[PDB]
RNA sequence: GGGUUUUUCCUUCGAAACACGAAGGUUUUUAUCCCUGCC
RNA sequence: GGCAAAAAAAAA
């Protein structure tokens, strides 16, 4: 007998000012004993709302939370880029206690174009024998982006990391790693290495590279 | 005031034992309910366990019980969490909480300690070593430009950059570590300054890495003159 | 029907989900207790 | 009308 949380959505994108509602439904009773937390990404969450209504001391105004029978809403009444966070919902009515899957809440702002950088394996790796070029695209949005790899102008697959940060609690612009990893004998062996980004700040797709040796 | 930091977590193999604690400080334990919840790296938390006050009672969630067990000492106001018969399932960040003043906020839980990271894994733990990123120009350099630390082949997570021992916070990008097919992982970290006090100031990154015990400290520079 | 004597469920509170405590509640079961004498 | 009686245990 074991009661579930069932959370809604899994991930949803307002912008500033948006309304915004999450809901959980109970697979059976839990009084109003339902409890609402804010976590950003790697930190401790956050008490947003206990008694699946109150207020926690110290929350701001724009979240509320409300309860009808089973099904519990939690309202963000305008949002705002502070928060950008992951929500739960908290059943405490019975033991054991159940949270739900979470919300992702993402943010809307404009579109704000990457700028593009490379960067040349430090030879302190090529000390090591093994080569890592890295692509960089710093402040934008929206997240998705696409990066390419050209090697003598031969376009490039299977042999790259991409790696982006969470969404900027201040600005909502996001940030990528496009991490190439080869040998000591590829780096030498081809002459340039260019990293071609097609994105929405860009009319045309940018391009930024260099030559090996002339560094 | 009120803090509480749990600790004891890291590199564990599979059917290992670990004990977490979790010292509290602003507020005596004997008189809330404290709870263990986990969260699993990406995915949501869970519930493991919980004291309750006075009575001493513990509960547990199905998936933990049988192996895990909680304990409170008073005197040292400190929870503790003894883990035995440890599977890759169970390889997780563990949260400490507390369960706030009945008339304060219910059954909510209002304080939860930042976490301490339990790996459960066959292999054995690698230090990073780590190379600067540099400013590349073939011309002249009066701009904005950016320049970074790449940190390649550790095991396990986690690794903690800092820019020149924290006087660096403006711009910083600490990416999320990637695993590679090698099995271990490689980050990097990026800042970005105006290049106009690039001549005059120093860069170097703090990065440390407890499970390996490695702290090491790059100098990034330019490139070929 | 009205009770006596024991139980429980619930409610508010005690730093308090259970256990312990305080102050309260209005119901109902057992033909498995009493409804008897006196001006 | 005025008194006096009597008396075991379960459940929400």
């Known amino acids: 007998s074991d009661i579930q949380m069932t959370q809604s959505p899994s991930s949803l994108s307002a912008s500033v000012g948006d309304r915004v509602t999450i809901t959980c439904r109970a697979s059976?009773?839990?009084?109003?004993?339902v409890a609402w937390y804010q976590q950003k990404p790697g930190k401790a969450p956050k008490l947003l709302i206990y008694?699946?209504?109150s207020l926690y001391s110290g929350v701001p105004s724009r979240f509320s939370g409300s309860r009808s029978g089973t099904d519990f809403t939690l309202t963000i009444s305008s949002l705002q880029p502070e928060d950008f966070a992951t929500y739960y919902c908290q059943q405490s009515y019975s033991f054991p206690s159940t949270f739900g899957q979470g919300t992702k809440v993402e943010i809307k702002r404009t579109v704000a174009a990457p700028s593009v950088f490379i960067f040349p394996p430090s030879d302190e790796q090529l000390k090591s024998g093994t080569a890592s070029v890295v692509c960089l695209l710093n402040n934008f949005y929206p997240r998705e982006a696409k990066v390419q790899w050209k090697v003598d102008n031969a376009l490039q697959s299977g042999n790259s990391q991409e790696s982006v940060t969470e969404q900027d609690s201040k600005d909502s612009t996001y940030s990528l790693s496009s991490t190439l990893t080869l040998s000591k004998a590829d780096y030498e062996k081809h002459k340039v290495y260019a990293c071609e980004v097609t994105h929405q700040g860009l009319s045309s797709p940018v391009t930024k590279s260099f030559n090996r040796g002339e560094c | 005031e009120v803090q509480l930091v749990e600790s004891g977590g890291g590199l564990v193999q599979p059917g290992g034992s670990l004990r977490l604690s979790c010292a509290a400080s602003?507020?005596?334990?004997?008189?809330?309910?404290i709870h263990w919840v986990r969260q699993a790296p990406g995915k949501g938390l869970e519930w493991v366990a919980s004291i309750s006050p006075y009575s001493g009672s513990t509960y547990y969630a199905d998936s933990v019980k049988g192996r895990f067990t909680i304990s409170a000492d008073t005197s040292k106001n400190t929870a503790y969490l003894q883990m035995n018969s440890l599977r890759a399932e169970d390889t997780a960040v563990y949260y400490c909480?507390?369960?706030?003043?009945?008339?304060?906020?219910?059954?909510?839980?209002?304080?939860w300690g930042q976490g301490t990271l339990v790996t459960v894994s066959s292999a054995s733990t690698k230090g990073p070593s780590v190379f600067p990123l540099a400013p590349s120009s073939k011309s002249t350099s009066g701009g904005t430009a950016a320049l970074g630390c790449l940190v390649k082949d550790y095991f396990p997570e986690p690794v903690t950059v800092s820019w020149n021992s924290g006087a660096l916070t403006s711009g910083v990008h600490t990416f999320p570590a990637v695993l590679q097919s090698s099995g271990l992982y490689s980050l990097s970290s990026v800042v970005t300054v105006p290049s106009s006090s690039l001549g005059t100031q120093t860069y170097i990154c703090n990065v440390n890495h407890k499970p390996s015990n490695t702290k090491v400290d790059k100098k990034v520079e330019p490139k070929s003159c």
């Open positions: 059976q009773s839990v009084s109003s004993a």
């Open positions: 602003g507020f005596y334990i004997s008189y809330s309910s």
């Open positions: 909480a507390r369960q706030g003043y009945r008339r304060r906020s219910g059954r909510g839980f209002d304080y």
């Open positions: 008694s699946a209504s």
